[PDB]
Amino acid sequence: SHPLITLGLAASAAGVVLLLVAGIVNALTGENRVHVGYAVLGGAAGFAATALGALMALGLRAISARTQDAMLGFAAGMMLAASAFSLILPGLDAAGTIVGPGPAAAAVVALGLGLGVLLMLGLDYFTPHVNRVWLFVLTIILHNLPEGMAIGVSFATGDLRIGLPLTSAIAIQDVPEGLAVALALRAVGLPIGRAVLVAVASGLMEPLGALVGVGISSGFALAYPISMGLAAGAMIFVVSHEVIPETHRNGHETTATVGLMAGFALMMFLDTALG
Amino acid sequence: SHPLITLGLAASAAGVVLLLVAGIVNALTGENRVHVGYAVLGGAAGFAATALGALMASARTQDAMLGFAAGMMLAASAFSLILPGLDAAGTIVGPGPAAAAVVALGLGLGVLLMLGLDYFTVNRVWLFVLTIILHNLPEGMAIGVSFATGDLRIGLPLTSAIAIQDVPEGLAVALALRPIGRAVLVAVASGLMEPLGALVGVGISSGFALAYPISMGLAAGAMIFVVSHEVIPETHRNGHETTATVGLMAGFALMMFLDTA
């Protein structure tokens, strides 16, 4: 019948629901702590940067494949580095305060990572790939939800040192993403204003994702490092499965790799400068 | 030709933009002490109510719920938004006609925003879908404004009224979007403008001391317009108003009873 991916999806969605309900219940039993505010601001920055990129498509009505390969390589490189330096490693530091240090902390983050990958892997396998247009639009609007989620997760401590570099890196990555989303939507056949409209709307999952992110991470002390892994795993999958294969659209692999390494090193700079 | 509605809409949208930017700037640069946790809890509740409605996919039982919500919404507009807005403005400029002016500005802007948003609701489906989803934005904003101070005594009554409103609206939005699958999906997505709107509602109400009573009037004026121009007259499309008339009476009376606990 079905692969174990279906069981992974079910257990990951159940885990997300359990984490999110634990968040709500705790938020219904605790008071006077800011940590929603920066997650909201960071998600709003994500929306605004995604809109800025999309609006550039109105004039730059198409770009060379070399530019696409460069742009999405840069986007991929930023988000792989951000998953490592701003999610996984601070998750291991956080889980090191509770059950670790040492591999007890790694088990908590690996539980996160597996849930994040199995969620996104399951969601992809339940796309059939009644039109490409509607399936692709649905895919696009949801695409930024793990980016919001990473924002809200990283800010769930209120810590500028963790959330600001990731949010800056996502915000910077959102401009290529929103532009490339808008131009892809045009190429599918939507009028450019309708394509740019949907691309702007895709940024609304970045605030909404940041609400989900601050939720799932708040219910209990280990829900934070679990959610750090979950956001990292969801991002890592989405980068490896959505973004990176679109960086080879006409074989400009050198251009794509220069973008990747530039984005990776830029994210390392952002964390070194803002952390 | 284009009446003063065009001016009033544009000036009120500029007011929303101004208020929101002031709230952002205060958040980024002030010792901001605004409450937003309850607002996103209330906005998520509004989404969930709108989703449940869409998953419900004669009209007289819906007219009963629409009348009941409308009653709850009018009472919450008066007792939860306008009067604590007047008390808030009475902490700064008033009491008396000075405090009344600050809330009346809010009420005007709120009314004018909705009066303009209604203006445009062939493939005109795109404009219908746009207006459909955005209709939940002011509902979100009112929730956010009601929770901006963290008073459960204010945020719970209004958010309940809007959540009860959201159940018939979810069904109505799905049904008015007409298989049902992508229509109910878009109805579920429409509910997501209430969490988003609740962030906007907290934002506009936060830049400066008077931004709270202005936004309380703005929330109240928008929701009163929604009731007076949409939710109530939607009944007379079906049968007669009577069942919603009893809904209006009962919902209004219940709300002020719960306020008198």
Author numbering:
A (entry chain A): 21 to 149, 164 to 309
B (entry chain B): 21 to 77, 84 to 147, 164 to 220, 225 to 307
Paper's wording?
The Zrt/Irt-like protein (ZIP) family of solute carrier 39A (SLC39A) membrane transporters is critical in maintaining appropriate cellular levels of zinc. ZIPs represent the only identified zinc importers in mammals, providing metal transfer from the extracellular space or from internal storage vesicles to the cytoplasm. Together, they form two separate helix bundles encompassing TM1, TM4, TM5, and TM6 and TM2, TM3, TM7, and TM8, respectively.
With such treated sample, we crystallized BbZIP in the lipidic cubic phase (LCP) using metal-free conditions at pH 4.5. Notably, even initial analysis disclosed that the new structure is metal-free, as the metal-binding region is void of density or anomalous signal from bound cation. However, the latter uncovers an additional, approximately 30-residue-long and tilted transmembrane segment (here termed TMa) in the N terminus. By investigating the crystal packing in our metal-free BbZIP structure, we identify two separate dimers displaying a parallel (i.e., inside-in/inside-in) crystal packing. Detailed structural comparisons of the metal-free and metal-bound inward-open structures expose notable differences for one of the two protomers (chain B), with an overall RMSD of 1.75 Å (hereafter referred to as the ion-free structure). The analysis reveals a considerable displacement of the transport domain, with the ion-free form being shifted around 3 Å toward the intracellular inside, combined with a substantial twist that tilts the domain 11°. The resolved part represents 30 N-terminal amino acids and a highly tilted helix, interacting only with TM3 and TM6 and peripherally relative to the dimer assembly.
